[PDB]
Structure formats: C-alpha cells, structure tokens
Amino acid sequence: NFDPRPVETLNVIIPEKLDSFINKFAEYTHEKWAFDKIQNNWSYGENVDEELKTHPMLRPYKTFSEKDKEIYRWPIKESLKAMIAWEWTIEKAREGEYNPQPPDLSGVTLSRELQAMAEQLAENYHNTWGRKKKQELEAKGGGTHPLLVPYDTLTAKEKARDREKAQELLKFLQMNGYAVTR
Ligand SMILES: [K+]
Fold first, then answer.
1. Which candidate, 170, 22, 23, places its Cα nearest to that of 110?
2. What separation in Å is there between the alpha carbon of 98 and the centre of ligand 1?
3. How far is the CA of 166 from the centre of ligand 1 (A)?
4. 121 Cα–ligand 1 center, Å
C-alpha cells in the first residue's frame, strides 16, 4: 500500500546566496540535455518537430527568457527546499573545482553519508511523483500504476532514475565546494 507524503516546500525559503548555484546547476542540466540531443543530431528549430529533430531550446541557456530558465531552475529549487525542510546545512566550504560541452560528473565520488542523503532525496522524488500520479489517475477516471508502491519496495532498476537525480545534485554541489551535512 502506498500513501506518499512528499515534504511540504511551499513556505520553505532558499537563502539568497544559493541563487548563483541554482543558475549554474540549471545551466548544467540544460547543457547535459542539449549535449544528448545534439549527439542524436537534433538542431535548433523554431518549433519542436520529432520528424525533423528540431527543438527551440537547442541554444545557450544564457539566451533564455526567465520563463525558460525557470523550466530548469524550478526542479532544482524544489530539491533544495526539501533539503532545507529536513534541516540539512548547505555551506560553501571551499572554492569550486551551438556546441554544449557540459562538465563530466563521472569522476565525482560521494561519501557514504552523502550517498545516504541521496536516498532520502530519491525517496522524496518518488513520493512527489506518486502523489501527483494518484491525482492524475483520479482526474482521468481512476486506475492504477505498478510503481505506486513505497520507494523501499522498488527494485534497484526502478530506483535508478531517482538515485541518479539525487546524486547529480549532490555531486554538483560538491564540485562547486559546498558541504552538505545534517
Ligand atoms: K548552455
């Protein structure tokens, strides 16, 4: 049985001094996506077109409106607000380390303790998805979904996407010299 309760972020305020990290990481996530698109021969085009493989977001993050940057910044803000909600500390302890070439995060090793923190983030992403999914199903007439179970009961394969998202955030924080502790 599954009763997902993602942490409540609505009144959680991110400190001003994280705004710079938020934009850098948003730019990173856009570049990564763009890089993968371009490797499959997508190119800029005014419209999204699956036959022609064009996408209007295939251009520099720097050239976006605030609305389009927000596509990438929103989910990062939601992750940071969950961490702040859980009373984790995020502090800049050290100095940090169209043709997108985003940094490679393959070589970033997270401590066991940060990997443990990634599990709480992943479970929260799963609970956010599961709560939204229950609403979506009810709005459409009812029905079910095989992943509407507690995160801990998921298979390793089923957990991967939420683990990868949680690891990417914690790796980019580390790379930019942030210590994350609880
Ligand atoms: K970019």
1. 170
2. 9
3. 21
4. 26
Assess if residue 103 is contained within a domain.
Answer: no
DSSP-assigned beta bridge partners for residue 89: 181
Distance between CA atoms of 3 and 1, rounded to whole angstroms?
7
Q: 100: CA distance to ligand 1 center in Å?
A: 6
Contact criterion met (CB below 8 Å) for 98 and 44: yes
**Alpha-carbon separation of residue 104 from 16, 17, 171 (angstroms):** 27, 25, 10
The experimental technique behind this entry is: X-ray
Inside any domain, residue 98:
no
Other CB atoms closer than 10 Å to residue 176's CB: what's the count? 17
* Resolution of this structure in Å: 2.0
Domain range for 64: 1-93+113-182
Joined together, the tokens standing for residue 5 give 């309760």
The CATH number assigned to the domain holding 17 equals 1.10.490.160
Pairwise CA distance, residues 168 & 172, whole Å: 6
